[PDB]
Amino acid sequence: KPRSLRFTWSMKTTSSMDPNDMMREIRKVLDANNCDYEQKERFLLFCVHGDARQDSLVQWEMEVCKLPRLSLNGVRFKRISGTSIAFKNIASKIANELKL
């Protein structure tokens, strides 16, 4: 089951979709944007975009979670590495393209 998490201002991606369907959509959008992901847990991805030999390498977590206090599911994003601008750019693009 996805983890149950407290709603915070960072949570901007919510959905009533089945969490497994959410994961399918997330991987689809990541593929479309040439982001790699490691399947850390059923509902947790370690994502990577860009080129380590340039200035563009960005790593971040994406997690599908339940938000019981909203009766919704959500997608958590958290930076792991990379410049602030590179993270803002790629993570915002992914978030904008998710069809949940």
Binding site for Cl ion (CB under 5 A): 8-11, 76
Please state the closest distance from residue 77 (CB atom) to Cl ion, in A: 5
Contacts of 13 (CB under 8 A, 6+ apart): 74, 75, 77, 95, 98, 100
* Of 13 and 50, CB closest to Cl ion: 13
Tokens (6 digits) for 18: 């089945």
Rounded Cα gap, residues 96 and 40, in angstroms: 23
Does residue 3 sit in helix, strand or coil? coil
* Of 6 and 53, CB closest to Cl ion: 6
Please state the closest distance from residue 7 (CB atom) to Cl ion, in A: 8
Smallest Cα–Cα separation from 60: which of 1, 6, 10? Answer: 10
* Of 10 and 55, CB closest to Cl ion: 10
Please state the closest distance from residue 80 (CB atom) to Cl ion, in A: 14
